[PDB]
Amino acid sequence: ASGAGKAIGVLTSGGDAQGMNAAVRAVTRMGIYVGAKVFLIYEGYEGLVEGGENIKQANWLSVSNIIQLGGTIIGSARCKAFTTREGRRAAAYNLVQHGITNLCVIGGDGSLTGANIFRSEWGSLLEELVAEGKISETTARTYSHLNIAGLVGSIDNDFCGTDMTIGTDSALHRIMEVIDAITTTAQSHQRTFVLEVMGRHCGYLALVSALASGADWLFIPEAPPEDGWENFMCERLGETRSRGSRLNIIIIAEGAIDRNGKPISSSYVKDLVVQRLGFDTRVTVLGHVQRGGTPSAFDRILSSKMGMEAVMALLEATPDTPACVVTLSGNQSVRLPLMECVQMTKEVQKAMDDKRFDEATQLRGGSFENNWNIYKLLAHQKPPKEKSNFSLAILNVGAPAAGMNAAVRSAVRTGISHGHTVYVVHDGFEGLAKGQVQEVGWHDVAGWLGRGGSMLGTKRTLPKGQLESIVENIRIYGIHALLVVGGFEAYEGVLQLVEARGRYEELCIVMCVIPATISNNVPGTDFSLGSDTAVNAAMESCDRIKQSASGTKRRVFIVETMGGYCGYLATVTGIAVGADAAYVFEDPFNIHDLKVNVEHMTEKMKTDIQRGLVLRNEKCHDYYTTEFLYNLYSSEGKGVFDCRTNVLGHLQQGGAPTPFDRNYGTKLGVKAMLWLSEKLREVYRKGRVFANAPDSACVIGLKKKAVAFSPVTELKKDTDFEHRMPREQWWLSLRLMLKMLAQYRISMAAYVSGELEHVTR
Amino acid sequence: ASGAGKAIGVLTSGGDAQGMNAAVRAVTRMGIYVGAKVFLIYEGYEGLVEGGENIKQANWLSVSNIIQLGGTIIGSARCKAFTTREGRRAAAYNLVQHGITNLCVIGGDGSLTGANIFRSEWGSLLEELVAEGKISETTARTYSHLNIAGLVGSIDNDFCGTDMTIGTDSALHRIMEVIDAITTTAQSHQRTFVLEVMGRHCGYLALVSALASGADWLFIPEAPPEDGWENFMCERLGETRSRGSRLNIIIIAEGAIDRNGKPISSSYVKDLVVQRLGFDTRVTVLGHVQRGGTPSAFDRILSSKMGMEAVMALLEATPDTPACVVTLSGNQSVRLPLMECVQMTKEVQKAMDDKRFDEATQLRGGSFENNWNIYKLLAHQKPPKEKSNFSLAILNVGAPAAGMNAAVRSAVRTGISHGHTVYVVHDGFEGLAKGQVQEVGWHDVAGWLGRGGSMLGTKRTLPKGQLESIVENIRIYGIHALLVVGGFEAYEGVLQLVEARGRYEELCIVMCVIPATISNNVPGTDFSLGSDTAVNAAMESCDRIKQSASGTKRRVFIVETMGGYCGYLATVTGIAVGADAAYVFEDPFNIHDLKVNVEHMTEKMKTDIQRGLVLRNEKCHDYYTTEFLYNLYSSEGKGVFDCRTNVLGHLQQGGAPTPFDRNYGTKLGVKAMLWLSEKLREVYRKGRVFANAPDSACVIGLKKKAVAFSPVTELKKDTDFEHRMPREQWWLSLRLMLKMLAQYRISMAAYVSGELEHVTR
Ligand SMILES: Nc1ncnc2c1ncn2[C@@H]1O[C@H](COP(=O)(O)OP(=O)(O)OP(=O)(O)O)[C@@H](O)[C@H]1O
Ligand SMILES: Nc1ncnc2c1ncn2[C@@H]1O[C@H](COP(=O)(O)OP(=O)(O)OP(=O)(O)O)[C@@H](O)[C@H]1O
Ligand SMILES: Nc1ncnc2c1ncn2[C@@H]1O[C@H](COP(=O)(O)OP(=O)(O)OP(=O)(O)O)[C@@H](O)[C@H]1O
Ligand SMILES: Nc1ncnc2c1ncn2[C@@H]1O[C@H](COP(=O)(O)OP(=O)(O)OP(=O)(O)O)[C@@H](O)[C@H]1O
Numbered sequence A, B: 001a002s003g004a005g006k007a008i009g010v011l012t013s014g015g016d017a018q019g020m021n022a023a024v025r026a027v028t029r030m031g032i033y034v035g036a037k038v039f040l041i042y043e044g045y046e047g048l049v050e051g052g053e054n055i056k057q058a059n060w061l062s063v064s065n066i067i068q069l070g071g072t073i074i075g076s077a078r079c080k081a082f083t084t085r086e087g088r089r090a091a092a093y094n095l096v097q098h099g100i101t102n103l104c105v106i107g108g109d110g111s112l113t114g115a116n117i118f119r120s121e122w123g124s125l126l127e128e129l130v131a132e133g134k135i136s137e138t139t140a141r142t143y144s145h146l147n148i149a150g151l152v153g154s155i156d157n158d159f160c161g162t163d164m165t166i167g168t169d170s171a172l173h174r175i176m177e178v179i180d181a182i183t184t185t186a187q188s189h190q191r192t193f194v195l196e197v198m199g200r201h202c203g204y205l206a207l208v209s210a211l212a213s214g215a216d217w218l219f220i221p222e223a224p225p226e227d228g229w230e231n232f233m234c235e236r237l238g239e240t241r242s243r244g245s246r247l248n249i250i251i252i253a254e255g256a257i258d259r260n261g262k263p264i265s266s267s268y269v270k271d272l273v274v275q276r277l278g279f280d281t282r283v284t285v286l287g288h289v290q291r292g293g294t295p296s297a298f299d300r301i302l303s304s305k306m307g308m309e310a311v312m313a314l315l316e317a318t319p320d321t322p323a324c325v326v327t328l329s330g331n332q333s334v335r336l337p338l339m340e341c342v343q344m345t346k347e348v349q350k351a352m353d354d355k356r357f358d359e360a361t362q363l364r365g366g367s368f369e370n371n372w373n374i375y376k377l378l379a380h381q382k383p384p385k386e387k388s389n390f391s392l393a394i395l396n397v398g399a400p401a402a403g404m405n406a407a408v409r410s411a412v413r414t415g416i417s418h419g420h421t422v423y424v425v426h427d428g429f430e431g432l433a434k435g436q437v438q439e440v441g442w443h444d445v446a447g448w449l450g451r452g453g454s455m456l457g458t459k460r461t462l463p464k465g466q467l468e469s470i471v472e473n474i475r476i477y478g479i480h481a482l483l484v485v486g487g488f489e490a491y492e493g494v495l496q497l498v499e500a501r502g503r504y505e506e507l508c509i510v511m512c513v514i515p516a517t518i519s520n521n522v523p524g525t526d527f528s529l530g531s532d533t534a535v536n537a538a539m540e541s542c543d544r545i546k547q548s549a550s551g552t553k554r555r556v557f558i559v560e561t562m563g564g565y566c567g568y569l570a571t572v573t574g575i576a577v578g579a580d581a582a583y584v585f586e587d588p589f590n591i592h593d594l595k596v597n598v599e600h601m602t603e604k605m606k607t608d609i610q611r612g613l614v615l616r617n618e619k620c621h622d623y624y625t626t627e628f629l630y631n632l633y634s635s636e637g638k639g640v641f642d643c644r645t646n647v648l649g650h651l652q653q654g655g656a657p658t659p660f661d662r663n664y665g666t667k668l669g670v671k672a673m674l675w676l677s678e679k680l681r682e683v684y685r686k687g688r689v690f691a692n693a694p695d696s697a698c699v700i701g702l703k704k705k706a707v708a709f710s711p712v713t714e715l716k717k718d719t720d721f722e723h724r725m726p727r728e729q730w731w732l733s734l735r736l737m738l739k740m741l742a743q744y745r746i747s748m749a750a751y752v753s754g755e756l757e758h759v760t761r
């Protein structure tokens, strides 16, 4: 089973997408965990060509304390030698000299195209090499097949077969940090913010940034503006002014063009806005800042997961299986053949060269086209000539969570678009019982994207204690549908209404839960809205804490995370920060396990690594509290290291939503409203709505590869109501990666890796 | 004493310098604290002109929860009406309609010039107004004098009479956050980062940014580059490359010009670098980003202090005293007449218009010229043809503090420039005893500016125990001077070596202490190096913690800060965050005070403010611990508010240095090395150095007005060695401002405000 006796090469090429270091670290430590030799190829294809000193065998400590570092410690370089066979043969030679039959390439679209051409010529190159006399025929029959696992590391997301690439989330973090400097200010005068992003070829970053910030206008090469856009944009900005909105945001991609080939410069848009509107217009160009900064939490987790799966795919790959790209579609890890993805990239590039230009946006992926449609719908209120008798109320229930406001904003706009009479209720079910219902308009949710917490009130109270008041207010306002954006109490409340349908006919209304909580403890989804924000805040605090012990001092930090009984937050935070241990309820531990971990910490602490970090979920154990672990680690580490403690309380809670949370809540609010409308039309009969079937009460759910509406009655089986968490949680497999990356010899035979799947056309 | 029966107008005009809201809050809350009526003039001189609805009386809750908001809630506008007498008379009318004889103007150079011209014509405007018949002669003899107290709110720092303006520090935070996105990444390939700042008129932001980032080249309008700079710059980048330095930083202000009037564009410098060097050159333009984000801690404290002092100066001002600008030169508050500052601004502007252009940089202020000289000296190693037999050792003692590395870098470069043989000892006095002395060069400290913690090791061990080893290693390495960068342990250790001079002849060496600690507990200075970073990290956590209760929920947070017995960090953090109380050791409190403050919080929480925040210094009280205050506040607030606890542990410690800390440590490290060289030349006699007088062992200050050198023996009198803090600390008067801004009726007769001072030519 283990890949002993075989060597794995890892290289980085192209622009240094942040999060590359996490992928390299995971690749290295998995490769030497399974017994394979890991060789770090410095400067990418450059050092592949020259080789020699540029190829060094890695140990466990060679990739230590890099997961928080942006860029790449291995280094990347543009080399033209790999384009030509003269240098590619030298690259094949240098790989044969080290016995590297397995190569992991972490790079952009050009990097993976070069890897594809390198596999396609690997046999011919070896033949010509033995023919020229630099390797004997023996020692060439071995290494006859080169195994390639590709990792898409780039801020462009230009590789068509892949939905999400390493560094995209962090590039978005940098962008929105810049934008939030503008939008979170008390807007004092009319000003126009023109942001130039480096999406020269791909406009994915420009699109997702515009969606996250609620940009007034977007210039992307995928959809150039129509003729006469000068007037159409300037009028849109004009009514934006008339509304009293004091800030306009223009997201211009570097590759902004018109319907012809003429590029649109940010300076042109600046002077255009200045001339017709007179707004104080200044162009912000990020430049290198997009690739800068630390990798986001998402980037660290996902890079670690894909690097691990890259290694495993590279060892279970026979001579016949093709070069693969380890990526995630949705939440599900998948392997796509390199050739098909490269072919799709070539087809889309030909399409963008005025061949199938109007139909190039669909080949970019359904995610891109869907994102662009959602952006345009939410940007400007188009006139909804359609009207419906349907009326829906939007609740926020449970604890506040970052991204509730993004979901509610999109739900309000989308419901107005369908002609629904949209209400909001403050204070969740407390206000729905108290009749604190207020009809809301399009502009009443203006600027709710970046606001953390809840603009509507939130309360944890369940509806069962005020069921009479709830049914009364439903009757009064004629609420035909009920959208509940909240945590486990949102799901439990909607469940109590479904169970109460038999007593009260008025509760037979379409209900939809958007799970929005820090803990990620709601059944029926893989990610709760705002879990990403909590994880990002948690790692930032943990990185700050871990950086406080200067290089000489040996110190361990016990950092207590929130999340209730759900250990998700602690474990992912440990992966992101390289925590030695993440104690959680779902993995019960006793004093024997603690002594093992503490001795493991001590032994590790005698080596060159000097800062340890163990995470504790707040409700992981009844007796072995944070103070207990502090005493244990400080006692056993006497004369080796000191121990310190830090309970991250509400530092993980109140932050503004990360860009992932904004876009994710945006999408789920749209998708929830679409399904609400579809179900309400399906259920409207006899002149009234009568929602009795279980399908009318669903959690929106992002599950594995796709969004999936799970009826709450069905989910009741798989819900641990005592602990307020699901019984079978998908993320327990991430514990295995966490423990592996901390040198724990854990037999991860239970980990399932994504299989080969053809591209979805 | 109180200014009852009189009204104070406050307006903001010009660019919305972040931290304006803090100044407005302090002006408002002081004006209604002293019984004066506070009128908020919206849109600045615009709403001054139109008046009416734009002039509103302020209450205490009008400035609630605004201190952390950037921009200005009052709003600023550019109005041309105030330029002409037609609108200025209307402005005087609207002020007379509300009886506002007192005006506080928070704005830039143009704002204060307009305020000066408005005072100068106030009598003439009132005469023409009564002549035209809009006000009777009675009601015009009163209000005959208009009192103006100016506050310089701008990112430009173009107002010549003033050294520091509101928003400069936070604009620098924005700039360096962008630069740190580039520099902290693992620099993988040769790239050039060209940052364009909006210093169109003043290049102070460009200069201080370059100093903090260690820019390779700087284009500032104060000192345009000489003819043929094209080649000289490109060669500088060339040898930078040859060193292996993989990143070049070019800070180009918007107002970058050559010796002629032709501006130098960032695009030109880009294309220049691309053509001759081929580096990946991308221009970053911040634009509106500089004015964005939250105000820094410094900005909130200084805005609060100056706004309070503006009100107080406005009440003690008779008809004869002129318009003043409340500012701080050094750490000392001062009031400068508005007319002289406007005159200096006009002189520098005329000088910059090719009149005395080479001599315009000096009239900008000695701080600018000194900063540029320090920048150029540290930027590029010039050949030190001078040499000296002197040798010095640089220590890092105590806890690690953000900015020690910046200090050590500057000390190394400045010592090498003066021909000294610079040693660095790792692990402080432990290394000095153990002989961990390593001679250091120019490039050994490359990129130490932005690195947090301590590159050199730190140890708290005092030198008395191993004094024989210390003198032995001083003799072996021939150490003639000792530069000790560190906290209270640094000062105490240098004091021990000075006291042991009588026993050991070798200890008669010139010594200098750079106070570098989180606690700001080192006697002889007002700001220890790295205290600003800790304050900024503390408020950021407090703002997050305050942001976490949302909507309806009424909750108080007890936040525990570090700092030992020194309460400085708690109190300033409480000012910056609007904390209700900051319990500190230096202000002993009993249960009677706690019941007063808890009932005060309860009454406040019944009002519309819902998030109280009190700070606890870690060692303020022996028995009333954070758990005690949690229990007290949660019990008494039962049925009114919930209580939660967060102990900010090492979240206040490990952060990278803020731009203030970098610049401060840079400057004083240079100044400490200058003072060391001067003292060593003054003490060299009989062919050897013999430093026996007390003046040869000093703590570099910045104590009230400028940098000072206090001998450690003299400071021993005013040092509480049991508590490791000075006996008389300047900042205890800031408690009065904190308590006043939290509605505590505290008789601040002990507070001293800066008096009138003429400009320093
Ligand atoms: N079709 C190809 N064949 C061979 N090598 C290639 C091909 N495309 C790119 N490469 C190699 O991969 C390296 C990286 O390519 P490039 O500089 O254009 O950025 P990229 O791969 O497209 O990703 P990114 O935009 O993030 O930087 C190049 O130096 C080149 O040597
Ligand atoms: N906020 C926006 N930013 C950029 N382009 C926009 C925005 N809104 C609309 N557009 C684009 O301008 C064009 C016309 O816009 P509009 O929606 O008003 O009419 P339309 O023909 O019906 O467009 P659509 O196909 O999306 O329904 C469309 O091609 C659309 O893609
Ligand atoms: N983080 C924030 N917290 C609080 N208020 C905010 C925040 N960001 C923006 N706002 C406020 O939201 C208000 C509404 O304008 P905003 O720019 O935010 O949304 P918009 O772009 O105009 O509308 P839309 O969401 O449809 O795109 C602004 O005046 C601003 O004060
Ligand atoms: N010489 C002047 N006389 C009268 N009013 C003036 C004068 N200069 C500026 N003002 C007034 O002050 C307002 C703001 O001034 P300005 O546009 O020059 O910015 P500023 O005060 O200098 O600060 P900043 O440049 O940072 O934005 C102007 O709208 C104008 O009404």
Ligand SMILES: Nc1ncnc2c1ncn2[C@@H]1O[C@H](COP(=O)(O)OP(=O)(O)OP(=O)(O)O)[C@@H](O)[C@H]1O
Pocket (backbone or CB within 6 Å): B215, B216, B217, B218, B219, B223, B225, B226, B375, B376, B379, B380
């Ligand atoms: N890092 C830098 N940034 C900006 N300007 C610089 C830098 N270094 C040198 N200069 C400028 O280039 C010019 C010549 O530089 P250089 O120091 O090498 O010769 P110099 O005769 O000693 O001039 P000076 O000492 O007065 O600055 C000087 O006017 C100086 O202001």
Ligand SMILES: Nc1ncnc2c1ncn2[C@@H]1O[C@H](COP(=O)(O)OP(=O)(O)OP(=O)(O)O)[C@@H](O)[C@H]1O
Pocket (backbone or CB within 6 Å): B183, B184, B185, B186, B187, B213, B214, B215, B245, B246, B247, B378, B379, B445, B446, B447, B448, B449, B450, B451, B452, B656
């Ligand atoms: N916060 C940081 N942490 C770790 N390393 C850093 C940090 N900042 C800069 N560096 C490193 O310092 C190294 C030295 O190059 P750098 O660009 O930073 O300045 P330099 O040109 O070499 O010297 P100078 O101080 O005069 O600017 C860089 O390679 C960079 O990796």
Ligand SMILES: O=P(O)(O)OC[C@H]1O[C@](O)(COP(=O)(O)O)[C@@H](O)[C@@H]1O
Pocket (backbone or CB within 6 Å): A398, A399, A487, A488, A517, A518, A519, A521, A562, A563, A564, A649, A650, A653, B644
């Ligand atoms: O109920 P949820 O959805 O799990 O909310 C999680 C948050 O609530 C908590 O229970 C704490 O809430 P409180 O501070 O108000 O007591 C933590 O688990 C976490 O901070």
Ligand SMILES: O=P(O)(O)OC[C@H]1O[C@](O)(COP(=O)(O)O)[C@@H](O)[C@@H]1O
Pocket (backbone or CB within 6 Å): A644, B398, B399, B487, B488, B489, B517, B518, B519, B521, B562, B563, B564, B653
């Ligand atoms: O000794 P100083 O100079 O006051 O250093 C301040 C730091 O030392 C502390 O006592 C904590 O130090 P430790 O974490 O090593 O235990 C805190 O007061 C603060 O974080």
Ligand SMILES: [Mg+2]
Pocket (backbone or CB within 6 Å): A014, A015, A108, A109, A110, A111, A154, A156
């Ligand atoms: Mg690419």
Ligand SMILES: [Mg+2]
Pocket (backbone or CB within 6 Å): B014, B015, B108, B109, B110, B111, B154, B156
């Ligand atoms: Mg100005």
